[PDB]
Amino acid sequence: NKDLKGLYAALLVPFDENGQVNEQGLKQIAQNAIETEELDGLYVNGSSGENFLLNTEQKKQVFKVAKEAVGDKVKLIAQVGSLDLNEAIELGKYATELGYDALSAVTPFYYPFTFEEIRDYYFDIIEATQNNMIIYAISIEQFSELFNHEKIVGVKYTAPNFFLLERIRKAFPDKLILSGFDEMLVQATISGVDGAIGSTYNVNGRRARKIFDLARQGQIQEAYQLQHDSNDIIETVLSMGIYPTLKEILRHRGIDAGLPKRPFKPFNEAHRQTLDQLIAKYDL
Amino acid sequence: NKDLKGLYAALLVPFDENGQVNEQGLKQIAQNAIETEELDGLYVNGSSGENFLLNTEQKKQVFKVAKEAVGDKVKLIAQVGSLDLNEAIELGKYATELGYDALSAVTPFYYPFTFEEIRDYYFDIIEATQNNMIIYAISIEQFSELFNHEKIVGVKYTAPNFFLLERIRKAFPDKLILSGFDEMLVQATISGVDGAIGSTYNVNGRRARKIFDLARQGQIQEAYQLQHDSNDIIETVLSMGIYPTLKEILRHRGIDAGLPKRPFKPFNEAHRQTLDQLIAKYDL
Amino acid sequence: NKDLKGLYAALLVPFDENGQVNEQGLKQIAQNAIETEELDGLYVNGSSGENFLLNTEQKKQVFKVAKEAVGDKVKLIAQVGSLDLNEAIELGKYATELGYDALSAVTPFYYPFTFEEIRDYYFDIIEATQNNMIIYAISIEQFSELFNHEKIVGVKYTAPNFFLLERIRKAFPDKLILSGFDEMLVQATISGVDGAIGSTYNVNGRRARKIFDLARQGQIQEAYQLQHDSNDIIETVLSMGIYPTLKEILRHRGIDAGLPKRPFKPFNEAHRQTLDQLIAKYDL
Amino acid sequence: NKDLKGLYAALLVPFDENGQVNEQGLKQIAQNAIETEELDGLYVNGSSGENFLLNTEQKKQVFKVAKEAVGDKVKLIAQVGSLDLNEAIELGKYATELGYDALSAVTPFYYPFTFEEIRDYYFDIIEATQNNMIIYAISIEQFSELFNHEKIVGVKYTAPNFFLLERIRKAFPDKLILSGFDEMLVQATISGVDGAIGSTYNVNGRRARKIFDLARQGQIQEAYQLQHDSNDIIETVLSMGIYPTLKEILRHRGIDAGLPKRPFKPFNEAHRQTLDQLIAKYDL
């Protein structure tokens, strides 16, 4: 199997009027991420896929359509984290046996779980699935204990703290760190991350690779300049409602983008003009 | 079609090792709330019931068992809110048909939902269930808009703010306000709440009701004294892990309180004896 | 000597064009708080007095005028807190010998001071003045170590937390607790405070005594109603800029109440009509 | 005059045990930064020099000694921000007459000042001194309004947010941006800052230069390794109390670094060995 370096699209998901998965749309979006946007993998059933709004079978369904839509070279990570540990294990099992290269799982939220409970949450999932696990982000000393598990191969780092990122990069040199913040990709890149996961790479993945490459290939100034342009895109998208707007941009490419699953509201058409100017300026 | 003032137990729920509901153990906890603690009703599948760790079928299960557990004298509120809007509607109808007096739904969390998305999450559930709804706590202007809908009969108020609570109370003298903070019951009472929902009422319902009545009768210094050592209990139980420690205190009464659902951990025995020291001091 | 319980006006201060103190205005305001509003005492050079915008000379200046405006029976608390400990001790001495019945000092802010540095800040001021001290903002055990000192007679309690207030009151029955949140007086009173310090008592002093008295006598419903009324007032002045607005209300009584000290801005005349209506509705 | 690109020490200040400035030790700390760490300039009476613990005459004192101690080619920025706008104007005038190249002012704190009050605080100081101003503490238009002023030549940027920093660098390509976070120099550098202001540069100024230089020449990976080194130094120093520990390191170079001003506590000797190890490991 792989090491999981590279740039991943946080897979977006198209729905009908009743919060049901549009599979033909979903296949188009996965294929847009690899063939058109030229990314290395898909990060399936994360935040960006409106995962936590779904029921278990929808999650399995998305896991299914995504894996079928792409070649064997395409790296795949499966987010299975859920407040329902039994569900996590079940999705973990289902995903592992579909051939997903690694699992990852959101930290137990809502309740104020203790570190110990958070820790044995990950360990229980690994134990029942025997797949590689990527965690979320916790102190250095607590990472230290998590990464002591041979099956916890790394972290999806989403906290915009570049002091903590550097301490983590220095202390765990042989561990996978993927950054989760699109608008600070070039800062993550020189801070030594091994790749990135991103909702906006569904639309802007070709610029993201240049940032990631130029910044490691010395050409930091040009990389920055491309981060300037991407942050124009990101700030605009964030301002209209990020997921529906991204899917609105993909619809413009002849993709069946469907709707957001409620309680997410659809793209508000009062934003239509501004979005078309954005689509025109950066050619999306 | 009944009155909703009063003190509620937020139903605690017993599980086995595989995180399955201990059916018979639940029945007891239900009855312990009504008969021994003498509470006006049951708040079912709220956060205290570990509800967000469950799948839909367990949630229906807890709904039926809690209902068949109690008399009709007993007010029943069904917490039905979930990130899955479809699931909330399904639970909503199901709880309504079972005869729960009002529905109730947590604020859609995890994502940064706009206020209009939050508003139409409630309106969608009300529409599909045609049952009275109790919301969580969002500004006063926004409350005004939400309370404008007729089938929104009030709010379960958990925010530490007594300025805002006073403003709501004044601005909506005809809507129901149940407070959610056990350790400040005496302050919510004289702020004119219509009742309270609590986890610690499973154990301490009789000091709770006396806090509630004595305060309304202006016997306030007495009511306070009771808060002053209901807070002993609460401070203690929080420092040990509130839901497993609470269900520990019920085991000490012959109730089959089972285990927490993982990733919640079982009560840690290193506390066991500060615990029953307290069960002793306050006769729990 | 003096019993420090009671209601205190946090003393507003009038300035001229250049930021220099209006002593005649100040004396009127001082007298208004005792003679007109019938308060047991003054709290001089607190936040409400724009104290932290002042130089040392001016702070003394205020301390002197406030002493010379009232009678011997009038309780007088001096806030001398400052990031400059040399300054605090200089004012601490000056105010103690003017005859102020106690000193108060804000917790050292801006820098992330440790508890030890904070503790010994308070102890250093007492040792140099031998006067009584009221602490002004930490852990209940920290309170213990602070209140373990005989010359720390109490705390000006400002944080809107009624669990923590309940704990401090149970744990230190012999210590003085004055609350600083006017809009939650009634809740503070039934929580056993010995009195209160408020900016708005300069203007709504008489309703505050009634709130404080009625609450204690079990006339809780009438107390809460006067809280409704007073919160209309409080909410309104907060929305117009509280210190400039409070002072505007005072000018209506013919008190030469002057200007805020820059960079505070003068009362915006666009709020004039709404303020005049507030004044008329509540007879201010 | 000079245009203020480059690296500045946030000038540390030595005190006797009564909190009076050790002027000869200060003169030594000043030359240390320029002659030994080879920095481009001094940032004087910022928070690293314990400015907000001082009185006005001490502040002028530190402005005076620091200017005397250095050659005319040294860039000098005077922090004259105070809550007392009269004090700030006075200090700004003084530092300007002494010859300081620019003033700088902390945003008004402690009170909830509006944006307008903040804007006109800066505008008042500028008009009274006719010196260039460097702002620091939030919107982009709020930034754009301040930056509209030709005397506000830039900003000491201390918020560790690299989305906003990028947004400002793009929107104002011609303004001066100096970063204030030493532990993220390399991330600041590639984000296009014109330089940096730092307390630890008093001790690590040469490594900081190399980070700033190497990154801009696109040798990002060796710049980053030097950031790894500097963060060891910064993390250790924060864990021991940063200002006292920085001055202890200076003392080891024969500088009379004296004592922190109370309520700051002096360096704790239980940290001596760990500090000696750091000094040895990094040749400090």
Ligand SMILES: CC(=O)N[C@@H]([C@@H](O)[C@H](O)[C@H](O)CO)[C@@H](O)C[C@H](O)C(=O)O
């Ligand atoms: C919370 C979130 O959606 N963040 C996403 C980022 O791609 C974007 O920067 C974010 O959507 C907007 O900045 C990304 O990390 C998604 C996340 O990896 C996931 O699990 O889908």
Ligand SMILES: CC(=O)N[C@@H]([C@@H](O)[C@H](O)[C@H](O)CO)[C@@H](O)C[C@H](O)C(=O)O
């Ligand atoms: C966080 C929490 O569970 N709060 C509970 C309160 O009764 C208590 O004050 C809490 O358990 C202890 O602070 C209660 O509001 C739970 C809530 O009502 C529910 O839906 O179960």
Ligand SMILES: CC(=O)N[C@@H]([C@@H](O)[C@H](O)[C@H](O)CO)[C@@H](O)C[C@H](O)C(=O)O
């Ligand atoms: C921060 C502040 O000025 N709070 C005041 C309260 O009286 C009022 O509740 C506040 O002004 C309006 O909520 C009062 O505590 C003043 C303060 O104690 C002081 O030292 O002057």
Ligand SMILES: CC(=O)N[C@@H]([C@@H](O)[C@H](O)[C@H](O)CO)[C@@H](O)C[C@H](O)C(=O)O
């Ligand atoms: C609050 C503080 O001391 N920050 C300093 C930074 O150099 C360091 O990164 C800070 O010490 C944390 O490491 C520095 O920015 C101080 C500031 O520039 C000043 O005005 O002295």
